[PDB]
Ligand binder design. Structure first.
Ligand code: CL
Ligand code: CL
Length: 229
């Protein structure tokens, strides 16, 4: 049993995330549900006190293996199992700061655990990330291409909405590397539509978020694949 046969729904998730931003160290944990292909939630909480940054900016750090793929695009993230992959991200909040994250994953008993680290240095202390002035990030199209002999790369430019109704841009790039000691067949160039919605739990006493992601792959520009050898 490998690849897509390992991703029979429903499934669940866990996260452990160790972070630091501008010298403030913090931890997040969470549990989540994946009811069906491409719809996945995560109820996360800060275990060290209040989260020292926007929940909206930490959203993308908070599981591409749950994306919904049609049959005729390789689901690279799922095809990495067994063996797993790492994800290394850079998120440049333009005029504000840059963060990186590193993610390792394991699958057991229908549950994907993410163990993530986040490092962020040089953020503007009065910017929207540190003062928590963001409301949401708008849905994006993530460009996915083959990268090196055995990886993929993901890129997006994301609009973050502030409380005053104006926008800040994040520029984001990820590299996915199989760690399972084997070759995984790369997909053709394609795109992932990503929508992230956040709400609070009516009762939870912790600093937390209840997040849902919809992620759907599609060959949005058929000609793109020609450009990536
Ligand atoms: Cl927030
Ligand atoms: Cl493909």
């Amino acid at each position: 049993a490998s690849g897509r046969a390992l991703f029979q729904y429903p499934m669940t998730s866990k996260i452990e995330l160790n972070g630091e931003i501008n010298g403030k160290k913090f931890k997040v944990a969470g549990e989540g549900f994946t009811p069906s292909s491409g719809r996945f939630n995560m109820h996360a909480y800060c275990t060290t006190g209040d989260l020292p940054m926007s929940w909206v900016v930490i959203a993308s750090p908070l599981f591409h293996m749950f994306a919904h793929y049609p049959e005729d695009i390789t689901h690279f993230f799922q095809e990495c199992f067994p063996g797993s992959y790492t994800l290394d991200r850079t998120l440049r909040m333009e005029g504000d700061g840059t963060l990186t994250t590193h993610h390792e994953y394991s699958l057991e008993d229908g549950c994907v655990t993410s163990k993530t680290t986040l490092n962020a240095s040089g953020f503007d202390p009065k910017g929207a990330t540190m003062t928590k002035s963001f409301v949401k990030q708008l849905p994006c199209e993530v460009k996915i291409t083959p990268h090196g002999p055995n990886g993929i790369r993901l890129t997006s430019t994301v609009l973050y909405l502030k409380e005053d109704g104006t926008i800040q841009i994040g520029t984001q790039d990820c590299i996915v590397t199989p760690v399972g000691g084997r070759k995984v067949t790369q997909p053709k160039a394609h795109f992932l539509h990503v929508q992230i919605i956040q709400k609070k739990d009516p009762n939870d006493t912790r600093d937390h978020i209840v997040q849902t992601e919809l992620a759907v792959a599609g060959n949005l520009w058929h000609g793109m694949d020609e450009l990536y050898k």
